[PDB]
Amino acid sequence: APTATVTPSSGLSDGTVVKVAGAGLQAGTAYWVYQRAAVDTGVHASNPADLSSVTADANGSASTSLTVRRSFEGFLFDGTRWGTVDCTTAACQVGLSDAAGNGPEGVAISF
Amino acid sequence: APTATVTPSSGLSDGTVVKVAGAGLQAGTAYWVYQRAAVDTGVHASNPADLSSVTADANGSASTSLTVRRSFEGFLFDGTRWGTVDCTTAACQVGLSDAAGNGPEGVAISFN
Ligand SMILES: C[C@]12CC[C@H]3[C@@H](CCC4=CC(=O)CC[C@@]43C)[C@@H]1CC[C@@H]2OC(=O)CCC(=O)O
Ligand SMILES: C[C@]12CC[C@H]3[C@@H](CCC4=CC(=O)CC[C@@]43C)[C@@H]1CC[C@@H]2OC(=O)CCC(=O)O
Ligand SMILES: C[C@]12CC[C@H]3[C@@H](CCC4=CC(=O)CC[C@@]43C)[C@@H]1CC[C@@H]2OC(=O)CCC(=O)O
């Protein structure tokens, strides 16, 4: 199954740059690399401002840089502006999803 | 039918804030407000960095502010990083799309 890692994923400050890496992804496919938090069970609010992506190489691997924030203006997948999200108490993680919502499990990060 | 407007939409500069307004929208529905450019027939590369949204009110109306860029990192609807889009030569516009791709037609914008 698809895996992902965020290094470093702890002791992060606002504006910190981390490396997001995916493995066991499908070659050639694009995966949205983004910061998020579940404002409801199974319902994620993300940060498009610093969003980015990645296309798994022939071995289904890829990594990139992501700028994380302690707090960010979160939007839902349906486009709705949810509101400001403070990762200080919210369980923010870095997601890796393709255009159909598939990919590895979100990686918990903390500040 | 849904309709959109961008003011200003001419003589714009990198960093300019414009008013994007939608009408004839589904009351209660959210619509992404974003800058884009067609890099191919029916294929747009958007600017997520300054992306924003709106949620139509009871009368299917809604507006908000959007910061525009002369240049930006473009992304395709499927998540692909396309490349740098330069609105100096690219026909850039402003989109208003719901989670299903529905919404008014793109509004053409231009820079100085
Ligand atoms: C209340 C809550 C933690 C605080 C979250 C809230 C969702 C809304 C929310 C957004 C923020 O950015 C601030 C924290 C916060 C208000 C979460 C919904 C369920 C959750 O509960 C837990 O922490 C789960 C307990 C556990 O760790 O097992
Ligand atoms: C593309 C997507 C909606 C747009 C999301 C994307 C995750 C990355 C992302 C972060 C943002 O803050 C902007 C929107 C966006 C680019 C989501 C991953 C799956 C999702 O789609 C769905 O809700 C599921 C579609 C379905 O299979 O019905
Ligand atoms: C949601 C969407 C993909 C994600 C796009 C969104 C437009 C706004 C936008 C700007 C970005 O730069 C991030 C992705 C994103 C948030 C698109 C509008 C329609 C599109 O999806 C479809 O083609 C619709 C497929 C379907 O019928 O489910």
From Swiss-Prot, chain A:
It comes from the Bacteria. GO terms for biological process: defense response to bacterium. Keywords: Antibiotic, Antimicrobial, Disulfide bond, DNA-binding, Signal. Transmembrane segments: none annotated. Belongs to the neocarzinostatin family. The keyword Nucleus does not apply. This is Neocarzinostatin. The gene is ncsA. NCS has antibiotic activity (for Gram-positive bacteria) and antitumor activity (for certain mouse tumors). NCS binds non-covalently to a chromophore which is the cytotoxic and mutagenic component of the antibiotic. The chromophore binds to DNA as a weak intercalator and causes single- and double-strand breaks. One of its GO terms (molecular function) is DNA binding. Disulfide bonds join 36-46, 87-92.
